[PDB]
Amino acid sequence: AFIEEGTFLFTSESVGEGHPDKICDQISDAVLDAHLQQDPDAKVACETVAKTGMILLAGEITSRAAVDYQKVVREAVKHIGYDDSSKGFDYKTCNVLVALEQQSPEDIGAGDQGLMFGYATDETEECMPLTIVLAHKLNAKLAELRRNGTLPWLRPDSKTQVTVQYMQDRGAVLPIRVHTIVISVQHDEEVCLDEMRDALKEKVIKAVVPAKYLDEDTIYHLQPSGRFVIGGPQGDAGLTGRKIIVDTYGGWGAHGGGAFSGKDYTKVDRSAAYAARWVAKSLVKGGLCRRVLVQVSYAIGVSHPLSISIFHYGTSQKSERELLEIVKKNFDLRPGVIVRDLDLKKPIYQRTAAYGHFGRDSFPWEVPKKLKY
Amino acid sequence: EGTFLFTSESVGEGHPDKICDQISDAVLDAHLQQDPDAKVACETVAKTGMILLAGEITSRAAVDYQKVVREAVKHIGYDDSSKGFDYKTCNVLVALEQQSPDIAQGDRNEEDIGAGDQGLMFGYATDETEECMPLTIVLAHKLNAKLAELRRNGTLPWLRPDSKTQVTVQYMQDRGAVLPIRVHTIVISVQHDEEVCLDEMRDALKEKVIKAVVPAKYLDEDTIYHLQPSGRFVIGGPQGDAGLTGRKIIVDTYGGWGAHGGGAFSGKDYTKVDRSAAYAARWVAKSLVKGGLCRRVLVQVSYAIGVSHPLSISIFHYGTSQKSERELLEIVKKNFDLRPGVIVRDLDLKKPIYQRTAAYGHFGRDSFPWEVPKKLKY
Amino acid sequence: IEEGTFLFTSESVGEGHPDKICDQISDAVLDAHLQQDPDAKVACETVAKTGMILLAGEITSRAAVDYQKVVREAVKHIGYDDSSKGFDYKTCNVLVALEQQSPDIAQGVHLDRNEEDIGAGDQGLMFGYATDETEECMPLTIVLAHKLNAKLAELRRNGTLPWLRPDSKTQVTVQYMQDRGAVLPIRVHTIVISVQHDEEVCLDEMRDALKEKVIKAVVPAKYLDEDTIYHLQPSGRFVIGGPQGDAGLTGRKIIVDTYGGWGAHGGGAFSGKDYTKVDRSAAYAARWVAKSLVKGGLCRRVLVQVSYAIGVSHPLSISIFHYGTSQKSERELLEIVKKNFDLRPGVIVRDLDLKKPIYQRTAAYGHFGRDSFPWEVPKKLKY
Amino acid sequence: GTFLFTSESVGEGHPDKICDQISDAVLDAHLQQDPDAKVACETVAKTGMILLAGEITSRAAVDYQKVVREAVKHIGYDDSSKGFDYKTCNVLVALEQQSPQGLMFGYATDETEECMPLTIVLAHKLNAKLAELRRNGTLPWLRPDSKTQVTVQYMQDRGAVLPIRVHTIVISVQHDEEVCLDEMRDALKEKVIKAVVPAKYLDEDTIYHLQPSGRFVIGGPQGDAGLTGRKIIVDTYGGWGAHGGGAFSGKDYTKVDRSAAYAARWVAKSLVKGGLCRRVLVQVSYAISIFHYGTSQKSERELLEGVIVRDLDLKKPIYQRTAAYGHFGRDSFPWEVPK
Ligand SMILES: C[S@@+](CC[C@H](N)C(=O)[O-])C[C@H]1O[C@@H](n2cnc3c(N)ncnc32)[C@H](O)[C@@H]1O
Ligand SMILES: C[S@@+](CC[C@H](N)C(=O)[O-])C[C@H]1O[C@@H](n2cnc3c(N)ncnc32)[C@H](O)[C@@H]1O
Ligand SMILES: Cn1cnc2c(=O)n(-c3cccnc3C3CC3)c3cc(Cl)ccc3c21
Ligand SMILES: Cn1cnc2c(=O)n(-c3cccnc3C3CC3)c3cc(Cl)ccc3c21
Ligand SMILES: Cn1cnc2c(=O)n(-c3cccnc3C3CC3)c3cc(Cl)ccc3c21
Ligand SMILES: Cn1cnc2c(=O)n(-c3cccnc3C3CC3)c3cc(Cl)ccc3c21
């Protein structure tokens, strides 16, 4: 049993831009961007609920800006792709209900106390687990094929799940292959199952997963239910921050529990999560580790981190005491300085709402810092 | 040296997210009382003077959502405008629909009923406490419970339902297991009224609550206490915040330990693997820990919609066992049948026992079928 | 002669008008409840706007009703079944905020009360009116407006004019001549029609079709001349209509429902209310009294007013005005009404079978003037 | 030769009037920053919920939460014990923020110095008196909600009506759980009714239905849903004259439902005050008629012989004042100034 004594399976899932939870996350980030464009100091905590023909915004937004919530929500939904009743949703005729408590208004304190985890594994060039990377890439490929007209029977909603067979390597993980792949994408009433499954197997899966991972034993659950036509908000309710694991690492590492979308820099469960990801990516890309996890706990009012811990999974020459000292030397994790270090006042947050907050190049927390130790 | 710190959070029954969780589980119980086969997925949104139920509930039951919601809120303890919420005059909007027929397509025999949705779900058990749960989450939940108890019996009449008790503990490693040494930090921030002064609340929380919950062997003289760190916290509950079902998933399970599959528990019946499979994985982990096989174990299962059997199962005993994960997996397969249709029979997931789980964690409490270990036969 | 004649206008709105959408949905909920619990106490208001139907009110009943199904079936019957039309029953949002009837009213009205002597469901004044200028004993203007809307709906539904859409609004101005207290309609001075349509049809086509296929098939040639004024689609485009482009509420078209300005109104909405609410029961009873007086030969044009106070079964006040078209002074007519008509809610419910689910039929095209309803059946007067 | 006529009114706390006042408050909030604002606002009040729907095209930036809560506070709902609380009520804004027909009636009767029917005048006065006694602490057991009804006995004078006496009065005002029925019915008779209705109209045969329900503790939006424009007859004449069916509250000048009703009232009051008539009705319709009830020396043909804003200043934020206690019969409004 040499094969299975150092081998395991790990699953991770992702959801496309049409998934109602992701509709809500993207709309929340759209509102946050709309406010940040005019008032970079806006204090925004927005929560979105998507149901059959209904978008509900609720939360606290104290800012000097004047935002057209109808326009923002409808433009976000249109960009998602829902523009007809035949698809189960229509930005033109959807209902937007605004319940925001807008009110006229470094060592800033934290927004609330929270656990926040960052994690970096060098098994991919993006320093992220392979399972979530593949799931996000599959959803992105489905969206790309739907939007350019290659497969007109696709619809915005979709859920993907990749099970990857891994082998341990002195504290790190190396992906051997792809044991299973599940795809469930909303479609129209015209196309038949055979065509859909053939297209998903050939045009989508084989154009994303390198052939060195797919072999003849791979298991394919393509449209396992057999009919996915009623989808989007019609087929399920959605809320902001209900897909937190899909956002960060798809199971790997850990999660403090705080949602990301809809929150500005002062809400520490977003800015500090970004800072912990920055620390972990810096340690991994700085050569110190090969797989690192950083836990940071902040308290409300109190500015400085209330607790910090590191776990390198035994992949470093430095006991995580030394790594923690390095993190203190190089990284100032107060929210007031995290803002300046990561430019968290820019309207660059909707880009993070779909296909994961991490592993994408264009984000300041994805640029490792030069560590001096 | 082998010493680290770990934090874990918990929120009281008044926290808006937990208001939503309790209301969702109350609707689920109301349906399960009349229709054990009810298919329920009920998300809840709570904010100033508004409770909104949205989701899909297909069942033969006839439920009065107004009474369910208002009695849940009353039991929480919000019964006056001075507290920021009032069950009598709160607004309940019902946007419930029928389960999508496409999902009902994937009808069939019970024993091989397919998964209600795909996804990965984790279980975890560490024997550092008699409940096989991490110490930090246990202490946070007990602090919230003590605050609720003191508020409800009139010992401290200036308390109010919302609270957030949330603790940092110092740990030492020992051959893959963790032993808690002391409580490094404790943060308490509980809603109160205007007439009470800050010094009195901080003294009472230090003496009345902390000393009656945390064993003295953990509290040292160097312990850091952040009691009401934000001065006044009078505006709380759904007012001055917003809630949603399943937005406190980590608070529910292990407070950061192990891992989470991202799936919310509250509002879902047995067909939703997000809840049934999480309960089954917790059962497997507690069975392995209590069975002596390991001192600290993590289990992962994954499902695909319409496929009854798990797509993948994995174990990680953290190096605290004589048995490699391969033969632990074999033990789990021989002893545990993890299909939802057999999980429902084994854990009696059709009983209206779900609101009790909505507050103070789904695990670590003895009265639940998934918290009684199985007799392992290997 | 312009000196001895006058003009009177009256408007009406089609089944697609958001206010009528709300009225029809409220009556649909009332019918759904009355089908199972004839004693259901229902007071439902509906608010319809783009992609949202909201039911708010008090419903105390033993029935179990699927509000989603009722609302969506009502909307489908109205004709909104695609986003291109601005509304879709499949994907519209239905929010239910219904509660139980307040116990105060329950104890003050009907609890522990015999049927014949249950107090008024609420205070207020209610009017009835009958004019013999039409066989339906209704003014010609409102009759013509309702018939124009009905013809538009009929043409849309059978596919004759596929470019029509559910929303519409007609308004007929009629030239009357006074005749010893009564009114005789001479001709139709003006007609304005504005019906929702699609983007691909040209304005001239719609104007010609409305002139020829709709108006000519409804208004008798006796009333149409070459001097009649036609405002057919006077606002160019009417393509963004229905709940989108205009909000709606229950009971916001009360005058369209009863007489289109003739007589008077007590301000009380009809839709969504059961027999205990005098706003509906007493209005129906006053219409019954007025039509009985007109059809019984006593008058040619009559108005009746009743008033109630919550918890008091008997009317507080009753008044008649025959417009000087009778041999009997209003005292005599009022004594006839008292002798022959019993206007308590508890006896009205039995005399008009107000417990049957026949209320959605009244939601569109007016509550009166249609023979299918008990209050439109004159009673044999005995004096 | 006499007859009876009833008319009702509703106090500031009535849920329909809560909605009307909130709609007019939103309209005012817009008109203060953009005189050309195009507003059509519908309001719905239910247990602990205020919902704003409709369409507003304007350059103004308005805080709907603040406007609604301040209006509700001015109404008097500031505690759950009263069934509503501006602090914790839910305001849902469904307004369609945008990119910048019908028949109407007017009527005037000189039976009162305000050129309005006596019944609606007395009903509005009774509601106002209840509000005053509730707000100055004279009767602390009163709550904002209230409904009043006056049945007056009239006699005819050559096509004109002259009131004789008040035949019936009904008062139903929300109270608290403490006061007893005897105290409420004595106070509503001696302190409210006797201070409003002149004694020449009240005699020993008058019928008093004071608190006919017995218990009216649950009231306001909790006890009944409300909507904008559901009390249109209470707004104008309480049954007298006629109504075109169009609601007033929430609409700016472009909506003939409001501006044209004001213009028709102006015409009717001008004819009555100018001496031509003693009781006149005017009927207009957009995309004209008169009936002087036989109280003029000249037929309706000689009496019949978008520019209103310039003459009525319909762009000024003076609209919430009209939301409660009737749109007419009050001195301060420009349409109540005969020309
Ligand atoms: C099946 S439920 C999942 C949890 C629970 N059933 C509920 O309603 O909340 C909704 C999710 O399933 C997916 N879904 C809906 N219809 C589906 C179908 N016919 N086949 C596969 N997935 C579907 C949607 O993407 C949505 O995220
Ligand atoms: C038309 S009734 C209908 C109320 C409820 N939806 C029902 O079905 O019974 C509503 C009116 O009754 C009035 N009201 C409520 N409680 C009352 C009471 N106890 N006594 C007298 N009037 C009351 C309120 O002012 C409100 O305007
Ligand atoms: C083989 N293997 C090598 N490294 C890991 C690992 O980091 N996790 C894991 C995943 C998510 C969260 N936490 C963990 C750590 C085990 C705590 C695993 C979890 C499972 Cl179920 C099974 C195997 C592993 C594993
Ligand atoms: C000292 N130590 C001993 N065991 C653990 C452990 O299981 N986790 C942890 C917590 C939550 C999720 N996953 C893990 C495992 C490290 C993957 C830690 C996480 C941090 Cl930040 C710091 C220290 C530890 C640790
Ligand atoms: C010529 N003529 C003959 N009978 C009537 C009549 O009953 N009303 C009317 C309409 C609606 C409500 N009330 C009335 C009566 C006049 C009180 C009219 C209203 C106007 Cl604006 C102009 C003329 C008439 C008329
Ligand atoms: C005695 N009397 C003298 N003038 C009038 C009068 O203008 N109306 C009335 C009220 C409201 C609307 N329209 C009218 C006119 C009769 C059409 C009455 C309505 C009734 Cl029920 C009973 C009597 C009168 C009356």
Q: Ligand 2, residue D217: give the atom nearest the CA.
A: 19
Contact in structure between B107 and B336 (CB atoms under 8 Å): no
Q: Which residues of D touch B239 (CB under 8 A)?
A: 87-88
Q: Which residues of C touch B92 (CB under 8 A)?
A: 97
Q: Outline where B229-310 has alpha helix (H).
A: 249-253, 273-290
**Which of D65, D95, D97 is the closest to A101 by Cβ?**
D65
Q: Is D284 in the pocket of ligand 5 (CB under 6 A)?
A: no
Q: Which mutation among A245, A255, A311 tests ligand 4's pocket best, with the greatest number of atoms within 8 A of CB?
A: A311
Query: What CATH code is carried by the domain that includes residue A244?
Result: 3.30.300.10
Ligand nearest to the CA of D292: 5
CA of A298 to the centre of ligand 4 (A): 18
Q: How many domains does chain D have?
A: 3
Tokens 């902001």 sit at which residue? A240
A352 in the same domain as A313? yes
D271 in the same domain as D226? no
Neighbours of D254 (CB within 10 A): 16
CA of D3 to the centre of ligand 6 (A): 9
The verdict on a CB contact (< 8 Å) between C93 and B95 is: yes
Within 8 A by CB and 6+ apart from A114, the residues are A256, A257, A258, A268, A269, A272, A297, A298, B9
Closest alpha carbon within chain D to C334: D3
B241 in the same domain as B102? yes
Kind and range of the H or E run holding A221: strand A219-222
D124 in the same domain as D1? yes
- Where is chain B broken, named by the residue before each break, C–N > 2.5 Å? 106
Q: Which residues of D touch A70 (CB under 8 A)?
A: 96-97
Backbone angles phi, psi at C29, to 5 degrees: -65, -45
CA of A311 to the centre of ligand 4 (A): 6
Q: Which residues of A touch D61 (CB under 8 A)?
A: 66
Pair of tokens at residue A49: 């609920």
The verdict on a CB contact (< 8 Å) between C68 and B98 is: yes
Pair of tokens at residue A51: 């149901």
The length of chain D is 339
Q: Ligand 6, residue D3: give the atom nearest the CA.
A: 1
In sequence order, the β-bridge partners of residue D153 are D4, D165
CA of A21 to the centre of ligand 2 (A): 41
Give the range of the structural domain holding residue B103, as residue numbers without chain letter: 11-113+236-272
Last residue within a domain, chosen from D255, D274, D309: D255
Distance CA D163, CA D157 (A): 10
Contact in structure between C316 and D6 (CB atoms under 8 Å): yes
Distance CA D56, CA A278 (A): 45
Catalytic annotation present for D17:
yes
Catalytic annotation present for C246:
yes
The verdict on a CB contact (< 8 Å) between D97 and A71 is: yes
CA of D3 to the centre of ligand 4 (A): 89
The verdict on a CB contact (< 8 Å) between D228 and C249 is: yes
Contact in structure between A233 and A88 (CB atoms under 8 Å): yes
B246 in the same domain as B98? yes
Q: Which residues of A are catalytic?
A: 19, 21-22, 47, 60, 159, 228, 236-237, 242-243, 263, 267, 269
Catalytic annotation present for C117:
no
A117 in the same domain as A102? no
Instruction: Give DSSP secondary structure letters for C109-158.
Output: HTTT--GGGPPBSS-EEEEEEEETTSTTSS-HHHHHHHHHHHHHHHHHHT
The length of chain B is 378
Catalytic annotation present for C62:
no
b/e map D87-100, b = 16+ CB within 10 Å: bbbbbbbbbbbeee
Residue nearest atom 5 of ligand 1, based on CA coordinates: B41
Instruction: Give DSSP secondary structure letters for A274-315.
Output: HHHHHHHHHHHHTTS-SEEEEEEEE-BS--S-SEEEEE-TT-
B285 in the same domain as B360? yes
A159 labelled ligand-binding: yes
Kind and range of the H or E run holding C60: strand C52-60
C282 in the same domain as C332? yes
**Which of C47, C50, C262 is the closest to D44 by Cβ?**
C47
In sequence order, the β-bridge partners of residue A120 are A292
- Where is chain D broken, named by the residue before each break, C–N > 2.5 Å? 100, 287, 305
How distant, in Å, are the alpha carbons of A132, A293, A350, C105 from that of A358?
A: 10, 14, 13, 60
A104 in the same domain as A138? no
Q: Ligand 4, residue B258: give the atom nearest the CA.
A: 12
Residue nearest atom 10 of ligand 5, based on CA coordinates: C262
CA of A295 to the centre of ligand 5 (A): 81
Q: Which residues of B touch C96 (CB under 8 A)?
A: 93-95
Closest alpha carbon within chain A to B316: A8
Q: Which of C87, C127, C238, C341 is catalytic?
A: C238
Residue nearest atom 13 of ligand 4, based on CA coordinates: B258
Neighbours of B119 (CB within 10 A): 29
b/e map D276-292, b = 16+ CB within 10 Å: bbbbbbbbbbeeebbbb
3-state secondary structure of C68: helix
CA of D149 to the centre of ligand 5 (A): 26
Q: Is D291 in the pocket of ligand 5 (CB under 6 A)?
A: yes
Q: Which of B75, B202, B226, B247 is catalytic?
A: B247
Closest alpha carbon within chain C to D98: C245
The verdict on a CB contact (< 8 Å) between A230 and B102 is: yes
Residue nearest atom 4 of ligand 2, based on CA coordinates: D224
**Which of C57, C246, C265 is the closest to D225 by Cβ?**
C57
Burial of residue B43 (number of CB atoms within 10 Å: 0-12, 13-18, 19+) = buried
Ligand nearest to the CA of B4: 4
Kind and range of the H or E run holding C13: strand C5-13
Give how far A233 is from chain B: nearest CA, Å: 10
In sequence order, the β-bridge partners of residue A100 are A59
Dihedral angle, C-alpha C113, C114, C116, C118, nearest 10 °: 10
**Which of A184, A231, A320 is the closest to B118 by Cβ?**
A184
Give how far A98 is from chain D: nearest CA, Å: 5
Within 8 A by CB and 6+ apart from B207, the residues are none
A143 in the same domain as A203? yes
Catalytic annotation present for C277:
yes
B141 in the same domain as B230? yes
Ramachandran assignment for D248, one of left (phi > 0), alpha (psi -120 to 50 degrees), beta (any other): alpha
The verdict on a CB contact (< 8 Å) between C99 and B66 is: yes
Residue nearest atom 16 of ligand 3, based on CA coordinates: B316
Distance CA A304, CA A293 (A): 20
Q: Which of B6, B9, B13, B15 is catalytic?
A: B15
3-state secondary structure of C216: helix
Within 8 A by CB and 6+ apart from B117, the residues are B272, B273, B274, B303, B305
The length of chain C is 383
| Closest-CA residue to C286 (of C346, C220, C337) | C337
Instruction: Give DSSP secondary structure letters for A129-143.
Output: -HHHHHHHHHHHHHH
Ligand 4: lining residues by beta carbon, under 6 Å: A 254, 293, 295, 309, 311; B 4, 173, 178, 256-257
Distance CA A64, CA D60 (A): 14
A267 labelled ligand-binding: yes
Last residue within a domain, chosen from B215, B245, B272: B272
Catalytic annotation present for B268:
yes
Ligand nearest to the CA of B284: 3
D224 in the same domain as D89? yes
Distance CA C287, CA B113 (A): 61
Tokens 């209840």 sit at which residue? D130
Contacts for A305-311 with beta carbons within 8 Å, 24 or more apart? A305/A272, A305/A333, A305/A334, A306/A113, A306/B7, A306/B168, A306/B185, A306/B187, A306/B226, A307/B5, A307/B6, A307/B7, A307/B168, A307/B184, A307/B185, A308/A333, A308/B5, A309/B4, A309/B5, A309/B6, A310/A283, A311/B4
Q: Which residues of C touch B51 (CB under 8 A)?
A: none
The verdict on a CB contact (< 8 Å) between C96 and B94 is: yes
| Closest-CA residue to C80 (of C42, C53, C107) | C53
| Closest-CA residue to D326 (of D184, D192, D148) | D148
